[PDB]
Amino acid sequence: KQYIISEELISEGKWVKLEKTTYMDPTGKTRTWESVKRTTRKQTADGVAVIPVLQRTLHYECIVLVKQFRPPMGGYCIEFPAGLIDDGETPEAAALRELEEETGYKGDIAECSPAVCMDPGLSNCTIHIVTVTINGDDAENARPKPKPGDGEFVEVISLPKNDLLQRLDALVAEEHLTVDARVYSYALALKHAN
């Protein structure tokens, strides 16, 4: 019933562009929308986000998260490890790579989502969510070596999976940080389950 008629470029940066989208509404009426896109898409999706499940025997299972300054937010955010997919990289491979660069951990793929949208009333940005387990008792994950690219400055924060929502709430109250909506959604559902 609805579809895109045309897209008019408004402004194109190096990394992000802004378009005016014309579309057909279901009544037969032509309407416009302001849409954002990345200039970097190639690929199945723009990026990946990694759900990294740190598994150490006789310890609580942890979700590994990252804390970074985010210029669009003007502040620090707590997020799943994440980056753009290199041209000719599988989502799985982008996941293990971004997890290593950001956390130093070496992980194993558990499952991989279809492409899923980030904020579809604003942008066409999509990611694959990739669930990865980390054998925290293996020697390669003993002293994890985080390999930042240029301009990445990442702090690693591991939180117990069984208390994740309360732990995130605590960081927000004490540390004046913003939690990512996907991380919060995950945490909420761990509480809502059964």
Add this chain to the structure above:
Amino acid sequence: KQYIISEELISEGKWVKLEKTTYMDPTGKTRTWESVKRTTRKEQTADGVAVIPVLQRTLHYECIVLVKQFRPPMGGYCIEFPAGLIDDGETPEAAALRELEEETGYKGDIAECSPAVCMDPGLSNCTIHIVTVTINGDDAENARPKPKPGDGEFVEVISLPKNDLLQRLDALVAEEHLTVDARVYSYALALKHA
């Protein structure tokens, strides 16, 4: 360590603007970023709300109520939590209950309200509150719910059992071209992982 030095408008639409952001990196060097913001945010603690609506009914499994709409930025149909912007002076809770009733017909009860969480913080400053609401589906109010959709709003309701949410979503993606929202997918994944 890191902070914003300047925010230069690049291009301003009616709804969305693009900025050149200058910030201080943790080495003490000046860097830039391209940043998206909405033009509609005022004194609200966030741009919007998304609603996790738990539909509860005697001798029924709980359902998660979702919505399907055409999203012009995406060029197609998306499945998402009911959601909308917070009106000036409106509380996040009120906005959630309002959007839920407008998009689904259901009258909910507030359960919990998150702090402001970031939608895509490498791109935009956009934030929402995630508001968990229960819907008493035994109540006459919620018997034959009809959406009160706004002008240009065209929303289909899809209620899926919480206990099988991820597979049910996969079965919808398998049957037509549509994108699941990353918050929905994350929430469904944690239901599985729990």
